Amino acid sequence: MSVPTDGAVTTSQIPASEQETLVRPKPLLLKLLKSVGAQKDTYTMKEVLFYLGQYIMTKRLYDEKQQHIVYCSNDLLGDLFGVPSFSVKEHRKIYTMIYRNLVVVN
Ligand SMILES: CC[C@@H](CO)N1C(=O)[C@@H](CC(=O)O)C[C@H](c2cccc(Cl)c2)[C@H]1c1ccc(Cl)cc1
């Protein structure tokens, strides 16, 4: 392994091949990723999701009493995704929101 630690989350809702896509996060997204330990400039989509999950957890934006919804209207995450809230269960939407904040590599 070339980095000290790594993380990745996958879902049955997105095809494997898509989750392996290599991407280069734009400024705001890269800033959030690094605030939780990420150290690179290029990631696979599943790594991006891992760190974003970590970001949500650390900022305490995840509560089961919120019935699967994350409320990020007052967080930079709300501006990254461009929505006031979203469901952690709707993965295609999450992917779509994330795609706007990056560029696919080569
Ligand atoms: C916020 C907690 C976070 C912890 O990693 N999490 C989950 O708790 C679950 C929610 C679910 O049970 O469906 C999975 C979720 C996830 C995994 C892989 C791909 C995607 Cl799009 C979402 C994933 C998640 C949810 C949102 C984001 Cl932006 C990134 C990752």
Swiss-Prot record:
Domain of life from the UniProt record: Eukaryota
Post-translational note: Phosphorylated at multiple sites near the RING domain by ATM upon DNA damage; this promotes its ubiquitination and degradation, preventing p53/TP53 degradation.
Stretches the record annotates as Sufficient to promote the mitochondrial pathway of apoptosis: 1-96
SWIB/MDM2 domain ranges (all copies): 21-104
Expression induction: By DNA damage.
Tissue note: Ubiquitous. Isoform Mdm2-A, isoform Mdm2-B, isoform Mdm2-C, isoform Mdm2-D, isoform Mdm2-E, isoform Mdm2-F and isoform Mdm2-G are observed in a range of cancers but absent in normal tissues.
Localization in the cell: Nucleus, Nucleoplasm; Cytoplasm; Nucleus, Nucleolus; Nucleus
Region annotation (Necessary for interaction with USP2) ranges: 1-105
Record text on subunit structure and interactions: Interacts with p53/TP53, TP73/p73, RBL5 and RP11. Binds specifically to RNA. Can interact with RB1, E1A-associated protein EP300 and the E2F1 transcription factor. Forms a ternary complex with p53/TP53 and WWOX. Interacts with CDKN2AIP, RFWD3, USP7, PYHIN1, and RBBP6. Interacts with ARRB1 and ARRB2. Interacts with PSMA3. Found in a trimeric complex with MDM2, MDM4 and USP2. Interacts with USP2 (via N-terminus and C-terminus). Interacts with MDM4. Part of a complex with MDM2, DAXX, RASSF1 and USP7. Part of a complex with DAXX, MDM2 and USP7. Interacts directly with DAXX and USP7. (Microbial infection) Interacts with herpes virus 8 protein v-IRF4.
This protein's domain notes: Region I is sufficient for binding p53 and inhibiting its G1 arrest and apoptosis functions. It also binds p73 and E2F1. Region II contains most of a central acidic region required for interaction with ribosomal protein L5 and a putative C4-type zinc finger. The RING finger domain which coordinates two molecules of zinc interacts specifically with RNA whether or not zinc is present and mediates the heterooligomerization with MDM4. It is also essential for its ubiquitin ligase E3 activity toward p53 and itself.
Record function comment: E3 ubiquitin-protein ligase that mediates ubiquitination of p53/TP53, leading to its degradation by the proteasome. Inhibits p53/TP53- and p73/TP73-mediated cell cycle arrest and apoptosis by binding its transcriptional activation domain. Also acts as a ubiquitin ligase E3 toward itself and ARRB1. Permits the nuclear export of p53/TP53. Promotes proteasome-dependent ubiquitin-independent degradation of retinoblastoma RB1 protein. Inhibits DAXX-mediated apoptosis by inducing its ubiquitination and degradation. Component of the TRIM28/KAP1-MDM2-p53/TP53 complex involved in stabilizing p53/TP53.
Additional record remark: MDM2 RING finger mutations that failed to ubiquitinate p53 in vitro did not target p53 for degradation when expressed in cells.
Associated pathology: Seems to be amplified in certain tumors (including soft tissue sarcomas, osteosarcomas and gliomas). A higher frequency of splice variants lacking p53 binding domain sequences was found in late-stage and high-grade ovarian and bladder carcinomas. Four of the splice variants show loss of p53 binding. Lessel-Kubisch syndrome: An autosomal recessive progeroid syndrome characterized by short stature, pinched facial features, prematurely gray hair, scleroderma-like skin changes, small kidneys and consecutive kidney failure, followed by severe arterial hypertension.
Similarity comment: family membership: Belongs to the MDM2/MDM4 family.
Protein name as it appears in the record: E3 ubiquitin-protein ligase Mdm2
Origin species: Homo sapiens
Gene: MDM2
Residue span relative to the full protein: 6 to 111 of 491
